Amino acid sequence: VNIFKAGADEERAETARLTSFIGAIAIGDLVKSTLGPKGMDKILLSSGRDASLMVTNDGATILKNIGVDNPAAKVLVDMSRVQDDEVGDGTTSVTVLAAELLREAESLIAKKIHPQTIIAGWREATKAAREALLSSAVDHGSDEVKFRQDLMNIAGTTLSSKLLTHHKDHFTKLAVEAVLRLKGSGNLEAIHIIKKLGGSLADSYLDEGFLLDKKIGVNQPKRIENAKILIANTGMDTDKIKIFGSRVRVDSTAKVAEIEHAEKEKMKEKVERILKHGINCFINRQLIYNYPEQLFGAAGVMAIEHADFAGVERLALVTGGEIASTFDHPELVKLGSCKLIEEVMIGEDKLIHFSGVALGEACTIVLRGATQQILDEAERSLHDALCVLAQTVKDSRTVYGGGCSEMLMAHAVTQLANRTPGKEAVAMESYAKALRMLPTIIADNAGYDSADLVAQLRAAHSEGNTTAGLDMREGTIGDMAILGITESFQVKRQVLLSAAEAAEVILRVDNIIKAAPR
Amino acid sequence: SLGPNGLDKMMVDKDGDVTVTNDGATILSMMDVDHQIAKLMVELSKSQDDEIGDGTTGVVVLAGALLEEAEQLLDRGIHPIRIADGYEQAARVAIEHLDKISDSVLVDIKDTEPLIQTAKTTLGSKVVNSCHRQMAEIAVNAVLTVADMERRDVDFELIKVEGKVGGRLEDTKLIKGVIVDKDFSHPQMPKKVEDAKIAILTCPFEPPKPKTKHKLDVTSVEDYKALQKYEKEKFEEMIQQIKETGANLAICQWGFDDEANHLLLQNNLPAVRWVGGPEIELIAIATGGRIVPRFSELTAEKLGFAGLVQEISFGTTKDKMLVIEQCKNSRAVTIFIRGGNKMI
Amino acid sequence: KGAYQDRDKPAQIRFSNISAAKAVADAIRTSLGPKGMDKMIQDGKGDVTITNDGATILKQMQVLHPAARMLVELSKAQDIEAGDGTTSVVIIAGSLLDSCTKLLQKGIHPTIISESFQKALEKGIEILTDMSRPVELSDRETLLNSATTSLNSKVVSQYSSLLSPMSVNAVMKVIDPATATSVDLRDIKIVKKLGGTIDDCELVEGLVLTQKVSNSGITRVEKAKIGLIQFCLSAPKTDMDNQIVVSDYAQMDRVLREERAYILNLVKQIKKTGCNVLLIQKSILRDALSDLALHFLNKMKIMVIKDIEREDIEFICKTIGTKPVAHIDQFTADMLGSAELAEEVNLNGSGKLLKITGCASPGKTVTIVVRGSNKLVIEEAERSIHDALCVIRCLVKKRALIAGGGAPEIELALRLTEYSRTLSGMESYCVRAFADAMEVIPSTLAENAGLNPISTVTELRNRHAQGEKTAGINVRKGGISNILEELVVQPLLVSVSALTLATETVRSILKIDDVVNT
Amino acid sequence: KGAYQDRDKPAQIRFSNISAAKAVADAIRTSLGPKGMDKMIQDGKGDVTITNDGATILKQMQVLHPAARMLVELSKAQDIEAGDGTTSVVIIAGSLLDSCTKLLQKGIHPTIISESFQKALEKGIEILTDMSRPVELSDRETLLNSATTSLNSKVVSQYSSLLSPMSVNAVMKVIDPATATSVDLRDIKIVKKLGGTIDDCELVEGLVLTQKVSNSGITRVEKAKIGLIQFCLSAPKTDMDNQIVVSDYAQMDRVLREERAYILNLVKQIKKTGCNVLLIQKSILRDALSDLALHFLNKMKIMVIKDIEREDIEFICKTIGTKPVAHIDQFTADMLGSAELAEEVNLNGSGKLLKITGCASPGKTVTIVVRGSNKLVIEEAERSIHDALCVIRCLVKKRALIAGGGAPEIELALRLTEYSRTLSGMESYCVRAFADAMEVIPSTLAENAGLNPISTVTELRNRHAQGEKTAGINVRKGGISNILEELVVQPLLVSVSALTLATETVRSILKIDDVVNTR
Ligand SMILES: Nc1ncnc2c1ncn2[C@@H]1O[C@H](COP(=O)(O)OP(=O)(O)O)[C@@H](O)[C@H]1O
Ligand SMILES: Nc1ncnc2c1ncn2[C@@H]1O[C@H](COP(=O)(O)OP(=O)(O)O)[C@@H](O)[C@H]1O
Ligand SMILES: Nc1ncnc2c1ncn2[C@@H]1O[C@H](COP(=O)(O)OP(=O)(O)O)[C@@H](O)[C@H]1O
Ligand SMILES: [Mg+2]
Ligand SMILES: [Mg+2]
Ligand SMILES: [Mg+2]
Ligand SMILES: [Mg+2]
């Protein structure tokens, strides 16, 4: 007898894990074609309204854009998005590793092994692998030149799997420089990425100051030397007295004429109070109406209308001023400083160029490609590189990439498995196989002999050479210490832990109950 | 599902939201069924959850077994009422024997071992048994801190479990303070202060207005100038009255405007706005202050004490949160959970 | 022996993208050169357009393939960067994608083709730079040659003798030809009105308004004193709630008299400054002009122009040198715009047009008015004028001038084939294909003119092989001749931007291996 | 700590099969014993039957589940082998499958359950065989008691005084009780006609025909000389294509005269042998009777009967003693059956019958004619008489007799549970489940009789534990008492075959672990 609903169903057997495994493997196979320096990106086309088209390489936006149906696919997409939020890298890596973990899981359950046995084996294996990765982590930060070289290597390895690889030598350092302007503040919003079409992608440059996409007023000057910027968050509009319930109730036209004259005079006195600070520039958050603009033009200052919260925050960071709202006491927290406020033209548009800024705490990156999709992909991948660089500035521990860290931690898992009895050992062996399946995939997407390369790496790591990985520009087994394929320790640790946790949570379901759709 | 070796159940709702859970009450909660007995069993699990919170699957399985044995018995031509009477008699006998069988565990803050062991037993069969040791300890400590032992009552509204994605399950901790998904207004002001006298406040930093409808007639330029002066001095007096109580930090429930934010900045007095009502109450209970509804009655003895307030960034995203730790004696605590998934 | 590469979907997707790009290129192939005839596009609503610009043709035509959309974005990016060549860039991209399809069929990895195309582009940019000759301003002859060349492939070609000199005069009368490094097209206001013929297009150093004079008593003003107004000439009303209460019978007389006196006061202050024509900004929430106010203005023998857009205030101020007023107390003749003449002209029953001409203050702005029988020719004429202006902007941007008529790309094909012959490896074929895929432009120019494409291209290759550079197709002679003596030249920036943008977008297209519907 | 057995599909299939078998069992569970009432089946077409036979109930009720089809086939197989107990067998199979679903819930492999069930079967066969007593034929009392016990649970129970003695007479008048070892039921021809009441059923040692006499001038013949005919009494016609050509006016008269002379010669050859009544076989392709032939036969004062089916000629020859005749020259009095009387009997205006009585060579064949108000009661009476005949057949097959009224299965349940208490292991639970799974028959005997089932079964177990065997449920007394004193017995073959077939069917069902829907 059926009891649920019309449209509600239950899969309480091998069918449930069949659906979960096939969905996770579909996610893994879709994401798999975008790993390594030789990975190839994808086109996302919307069948709905506006037919949005986006060319992308990373797995986070690929998985979040598509509409997944299988709940396991939803689990993988959520894990990828969470991992992108946490660090900003390895979303494709974590999704692929989870997919291979589930594949080895179904292979094991074919051999009639209880899922909790696999769970215990995986817990022990991930503990050992995390311990080995932590033991193999190299650290810097005390050094200055060595840490800068490490940052350059991290940017290179993060940016080599994307389109900017075509000009990687130009871009990596640029990204590093941007992070070097943050001065340790974990504020990625201090970085502005302005994307304008036209010209090769090698024309992109990190500005030596700031760029604002706003407009000068009518009568204000359009160039200043030795700027004294005051940044404000005042009204400058009609500017109601804010006492709700106030109205003019008079008996003549002279009275209302006098009241409007008083309103204009109070606005004039507010502008005079602003000018008393000793300024030649003024940046406001919301609109500036016609009378304050006229007064500013007459006085001889420069005013900016409608610079949003992000704009004023970035100007405050790059110039050093405070966000003013009340100008009663000009002697309190002071202004900012620059050296030129020239208007500079890019493409066909004009932007305000703050040069000679007092502080480098914020900056702008100009992205200029030949196609809007190229601009979007460059922006997303540059965001990933900046995220990783900021994360490794916060925590300078690094581990070698190219599969070397994966190979060594898989070797540790294998060594632990060899000394553990029972059916746990095969679970840990499957864990190690799934973990080693990543460099296999990188070589496959590259197009080399994956089996030979992986066997060579296994032999080299078992011997003791703990810095061996895939040299992809030639396709052999090289030394990541000499070559310089580094990676953030935080990124790899988060990838491992998140993938293992998602595999564990998915594997222990034996019943899927779907309610009737709305 | 019941038992440490049990397996989870993954349910999607009518919108497409996935929950991978093991709690029998919740599992039966999203199980949409039409048959009346299934509805009764769902209500059974929910009631057992509400009264106790443990053994939700156990009562469902026990009821199913009891009904199966009842069916086998009434197959032999016995009245259902006799089966029910026998079930009640045996339940009485089992309750008496289970009263006889038991022992006691001492519940004091001085020794927290048996409490931790019982919490560990409960935490088994759930995925969080990955850690299985520190979460039991934090749960025990939270209950012992919040509970009012004299009344033998635990108020669950003093425990604020909050989950944020990212990190690991190792980060699930017990803040003996309060955490709020807000941030200091006016980002120029400091992101942290040391031991702070807090001014818990409700009315907004805006010029007052009576609830009754009103019309303030302005009839001359002198009256207009007087209104301007009234606004300016209202802001200035409000800020100076906040300052004169010695508070290093203020908290307002209803938010405020720019002409107040700059005054709070320029007087070196950080504050936050748009804090929810229950969050205000939890802050008041934790930091030990008193909620005041008007600036005119903000004294020195109505402030609270905070060990430290911190603004925390939470990874690459820009979701900043405010945490208040190290109160003199916090009767309300917070349980903070982190992980690599929403469902986890 | 080798990787099996079981997956065949990437190959199918790549060939589909190449086929779509080739089809899109062939669609507009017949719309290139002087002999190419324009396309006709009618969208879903019954609106039609007669377009020869590739960007417009591709935008109006709602394509559905991702490669086609990337191509239309490429075309619009090339228009933004240069303004001419938006057809040739698409043709080049599609043609060399069709060239690389057989490279894919020959067993070559897409990455090798992309890198080899990058190297070929690197060589080609140097080839184009060497082929060029320096160009310097104040040489009106070469500027007229470039403008005529830009306008030859448009419907307005027969008017180019009366339309290119004014096209270059517009640019020369806006920017200083000494230290410019860029020009702006925003301050070149193209105003279009239906009626007349093309030979009636005009260039005015003053200001053109489509607004209408409110007081139909005054039409012409000699020695005009123009003054912008940003406030309102109506009954006074404060920003906050306004109310007047009447309790006696004399109060109605008092309020009427006081309102009349207030309006008369405002008009008297306006008139006493010598202002003889008034410009009222388009104001909402308060009547900009009152009937009594307009009556008083007419009584004091003034001309009033009302309903002026907010975004046009900057243009008007830059043209006639006036400064806006938002308060009557600041309305003075010391900051009042002046002009020699203000006229309102009826356009033979087709419209009413306002001219402010002879502005005594300097004006860094000109205005072009375009005339035509029907609307389609007017749209195409303004687009062609915009193309000529963009060509002059390219000349100003970087000072480098090359020949046209097929000569640059055919010389590039020869040089790049010779360069590919010394590049033994798997990239030799790719550089050769890139070199031989840039002969599509001379072939298209030959076949669109009715010439014999095979013999024309072969004779062009022979002529350029002997070093007879700057030799190309001539449609007046109907053969191949030196182009410089025929006065057909184009700025180098157009060709370089086209080549670079096409190569970058083709590399991006080659990086694609899958398409999935979201 | 063992195989995971990930696939739960086989367990679900087994539970579904067990549930379907239990549903089929307890659907007809209310049709057991002398107090269980019969069902009414109305099939898709406009046909209705009122039946208590388990085999017919299960056949007419077109089931869908494969296990239900297995159970209906089991019931028909038990009907074939035994003829009675076709309800108890399906009840037993469903009941012990219901018992074994709990075993499947206890983590016991199906093969172990099947082997333990087979061992319990092997023990139960011995228990039942030892419990019985030898029986000797030609003992009217035991035969009558067995027939009455078979008929009691049927609609004709109130007629058991008139149906049991004739039911045993039918069997005893076919075989020789000296050396039979079996009985062929084909020679017990059952003829049904509407009308009358059940009390007018009759047994005849002669022959009964549903045909009608061609000539309505003679109906009663005394000292009749019956003779079968397999040739056609019409104008001669050869097997190959036949044609008569006429070219004269005298040819027509001549051909008519030859036809008449040939027919008259055939009829005279028939008559000169002393034949008194004629039985003409039904011959398609050639009218076995012509108007001229029937005219001549009636003129010679004879009785003629036609349209006799080819399948009944063996029965007629075995009954009255005639021998088939396919040629006129072979028609003589040496191969001509004789009878004391031939009659055309009218059943009070509800049809007509032919009765041949007093055959001088009484063969091993009798006939039963049944009377009834409506068709349904007639069909049910036929089924009940057939069940009684099958019971006597089983008693003839193997000579062994057991008590009834729940005594055999309850005694087997005891002896088998103390047998299980000596086989400690994994199979002890399975054997105990088998032992306690056959308490269903006594429980339902108590339930359908209105007695309290739990107390009745408890008293039954207690009284067979005290050595007072042959104790069971009595519905006349309304309690529990000795069964042989109540004159309720059944042959050992019935119960032993029921148990064996049920156990085999369950052991076969328990080996299923998947179902596939073929195209
Ligand atoms: N230039 C390289 N050489 C060798 N291995 C690399 C290189 N670049 C990336 N990898 C490896 O490829 C894996 C995935 O890289 P990537 O595709 O950049 O991940 P994501 O898409 O998350 O940025 C990383 O674990 C890294 O170790
Ligand atoms: N008079 C001419 N003689 C020969 N070739 C010409 C002439 N005018 C233009 N061309 C060629 O036609 C090509 C296409 O130019 P045109 O259609 O004006 O703009 P676009 O380059 O955007 O298609 C140019 O490459 C140019 O070399
Ligand atoms: N007079 C009676 N008293 C008690 N039990 C009886 C009596 N007659 C029959 N039974 C029991 O009823 C059971 C079923 O017999 P019956 O219903 O005639 O055949 P079937 O089982 O084929 O339907 C037999 O096992 C027999 O023991
Ligand atoms: Mg990366
Ligand atoms: Mg529990
Ligand atoms: Mg052109
Ligand atoms: Mg019977």
Residue numbers in the entry:
A (entry chain B): 9 to 526
B (entry chain E): 51 to 394
C (entry chain D): 21 to 538
D (entry chain L): 21 to 539
Verbatim from the authors:
ATP-dependent chaperonin TRiC/CCT partners with cochaperones prefoldin (PFD) and phosducin-like proteins (PhLPs) to facilitate folding of essential eukaryotic proteins. The ring-shaped chaperonin TCP-1 ring complex (TRiC, also called CCT) is a ~1 MDa hetero-oligomeric complex that has a double-chamber architecture, with each octameric ring formed by subunits CCT1-81–3. TRiC-mediated protein folding depends on an ATP-driven conformational cycle, which regulates the opening and closing of a built-in lid over the central chamber of each ring.
Since AlFx captures the TRiC complex in a stable post-hydrolyzed state during TRiC’s ATP hydrolysis cycle, we chose to employ the nucleotide analog ATP/AlFx to attain high-resolution structures. We incubated the TRiC: PhLP2A in a 1:4 molar ratio with ATP/AlFx, which generates a stably closed TRiC conformation and subjected it to cryoEM analysis (Fig. 4a(i)). The consensus map of closed TRiC reached 2.95 Å resolution with significant additional density inside the chamber. Subsequently, focused classification on the inner TRiC chambers identified subpopulations of PhLP2A in either one (14.0%) or both chambers (9.5%). The TRiC subpopulation with PhLP2A in both chambers was used to further refine the final map of the PhLP2A protein fully encapsulated inside the closed TRiC chamber at 3.24 Å resolution (Fig. 4a(ii, iii)). Overall, side chain details for TRiC were clearly revealed on the map allowing us to build an atomic model. For PhLP2A, we could build a refined model spanning residues 27–214 (Fig. 4b(i), Supplementary Fig. 5e). Remarkably, PhLP2A also interacts with the closed TRiC chamber through domain-specific contacts with specific CCT elements, albeit these are distinct from those observed in the open state. Negatively charged residues in the NTD form multiple salt bridges with positively charged residues exposed by CCT3 and CCT6 in the closed chamber, these contacts constrain the NTD to bind this region of the TRiC inner wall (Fig. 4c(i), Supplementary Movie 2). The strong electrostatic binding between the negatively charged NTD of PhLP2A and the positive TRiC hemisphere together with the interaction between TXD of PhLP2A and the TRiC lid segments on the other hemisphere establishes a diagonal binding topology of PhLP2A inside the closed TRiC chamber. The transition from open to closed TRiC triggers a ~ 50 Å movement of the negatively charged NTD H3 of PhLP2A from binding the apical domains of CCT3 and CCT4 to binding the positive inner wall of the closed TRiC at CCT3 and CCT6 intermediate domains. In addition, TXD rotates ~180 degrees and moves ~30 Å upon lid closure, from equatorial contacts to CCT3-CCT6 in the open state to contacting the opposite hemisphere at the apical CCT5/2/4 closed lid segments. Finally, the PhLP2A CTD, which is also tightly anchored to the CCT3/6 interface in open TRiC, is released in the folding chamber upon TRiC closure, with weak contact with the CCT1/4 inner wall.
